[PDB]
Design a protein around this ligand. Structure first.
Ligand SMILES: Cc1ccccc1NC(=O)N1CCC[C@H](C(N)=O)C1
Ligand SMILES: [Zn+2]
Length: 139
């Protein structure tokens, strides 16, 4: 679990979104595992607007933050789950690090702010859904 709260928006993994999130839908993309819904309160998260490839992420299965080197957003093959069939997830950035299924939602951050959230993992790897290209979140 986990979300980004920026301005009048809540950004979550599409596979974990609630009824409320779908009732207050702004935008959704199955191919990125992202969903954005509207909130009546103000979000104070700063979204990074950069090309960084190092940062820190929250790993709830270890209750620890880990520094990571991560790849550029790309189309990466993701195995079948009860949420999606086998497919290419776009805007995904991998790193060597610990992750477990309940880890999705954990924020990845650099010096510039929120980079994205945990979306994939396994085999000693962790994948983050990038949000730096969604410029409309701040305006
Ligand atoms: C997060 C994780 C870590 C270690 C082991 C397994 C996982 N589970 C996953 O990768 N996913 C399950 C839920 C949906 C995900 C997606 N973006 O399609 C894929
Ligand atoms: Zn940055």
């Amino acid at each position: 679990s986990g979300a980004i709260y920026v301005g009048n928006y809540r950004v979550v993994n599409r596979h974990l979104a609630t009824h409320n999130d779908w009732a207050n839908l702004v935008w959704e993309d199955s191919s990125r595992d992202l969903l954005v819904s509207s909130t009546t309160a103000q979000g104070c998260d700063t979204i990074a607007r950069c090309d960084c490839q190092t940062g820190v992420y929250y790993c709830s299965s270890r209750r620890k933050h880990y520094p990571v080197s991560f790849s550029k957003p790309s189309l990466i093959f993701v195995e079948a789950s009860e949420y999606y069939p086998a497919r290419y997830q776009s805007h995904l950035m991998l790193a060597v690090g610990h992750s477990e299924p309940g880890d999705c939602g954990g924020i990845l951050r650099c010096q510039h702010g929120v980079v994205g959230i945990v979306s994939t993992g396994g085999n000693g790897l962790v994948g983050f859904a990038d949000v730096r290209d969604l410029l409309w979140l701040d305006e």
